Write a structure and sequence with these properties.
Chains A, B: This is Non-structural protein 1. 2 copies of one chain form a homodimer. Chain A is mainly beta. Helices cover 0% and strands 29% of the residues of chain A. In chain A, the strands form 2 sheets. A 7-stranded antiparallel sheet of chain A has the order 1-2-3-4-5-8-9, with no helix packed on it. The relative contact order of chain A is 0.17. At the A-B interface, strand 1 of A face strand 1 of B.
Chain lengths: 175, 175
């Protein structure tokens, strides 16, 4: 089920890609190299070989946006300032897209008075009501965003501003 | 003099390449990943950025065949069993090809009674006489070979077996 030969990596100009059969992971350079986009047809549990990995030196596991357990390359292309490993990201979604943009109908604000890192949350409630104001303590903008066919999700650092409730849609995987 | 945007790296299947405008460095996989071919239109002194480098983790400087000072990627694709860093290689030749094959009219023998590593030598003397018998202490076959338009050279590990005259054409660069 895990074939290394399928895994490809290429970098040219301002664009880098770590890809395989079901994975597409794009890193770009503005000021500095950082994670830009990711597309998952199916989330896989294979480990990414450093032989097939760009910039695999001095990688901190905690900063790897995509966990190595889910096939995240051990790479600084798998980085993003203000964000850490998304172990609690919505990896249960199967088909999933990771990028940095605003979820529709939401706003994100950098505030040290915000809640700490927690399991990733969906921007809509169980009712379908859109949570408007979100925040993060030390993260950067545009915010870390997941997109499934069910709805829109935010990274672990992005928490709701007015929300303290025992009801919330939250991802279901811990890593 | 050093533009990073030119530099490319790609890996697919059994083949990996670190390249730029004048550099082409190919690594292949049989059993294990190791340096296969290299072509230099002109040797450049630029340092290779780890962002553009494949497999840049845990790299031992001594095992890098192409010195980082001459733009050898800090990578395990830049490795080759039985050979170490070619600091004293003929990098002055301008147009240059590094591969693993036998220089025409020569034989290479693995022998512990051989001379130790030294500056890279040309297979012809100043007379044009072809030095026939070569050896190495611990190197592997096929032997490390450089090709310029002037002649053919062997890796630092490969020394002449019996040649008393220092009329040797020899690289005098130190790194």
């Amino acid at each position: 089920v895990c074939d290394h030969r399928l895994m490809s990596a290429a970098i040219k100009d301002s664009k880098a890609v770590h890809a395989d059969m079901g994975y597409w992971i794009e890193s770009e350079k503005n000021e500095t190299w950082k994670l830009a986009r990711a597309s998952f047809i199916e989330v896989k549990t294979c480990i990414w070989p450093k032989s097939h990995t760009l910039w695999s030196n001095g990688v901190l596991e905690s900063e790897m946006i995509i966990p190595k357990i889910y096939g995240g390359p051990i790479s600084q292309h798998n980085y993003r300032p203000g964000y850490f490993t998304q172990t609690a990201g919505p990896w249960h979604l199967g088909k999933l897209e990771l990028d940095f943009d605003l979820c529709e109908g939401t706003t994100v604000v950098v505030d040290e008075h915000c809640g700490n890192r927690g399991p990733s949350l969906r921007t809509t409630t169980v009712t379908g009501k859109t949570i408007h104001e979100w925040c993060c303590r030390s993260c950067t903008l545009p915010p870390l965003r997941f997109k499934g066919e069910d709805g829109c999700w935010y990274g672990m650092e992005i928490r709701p501003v007015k929300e303290k409730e025992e009801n919330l849609v939250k991802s279901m995987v811990s890593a």
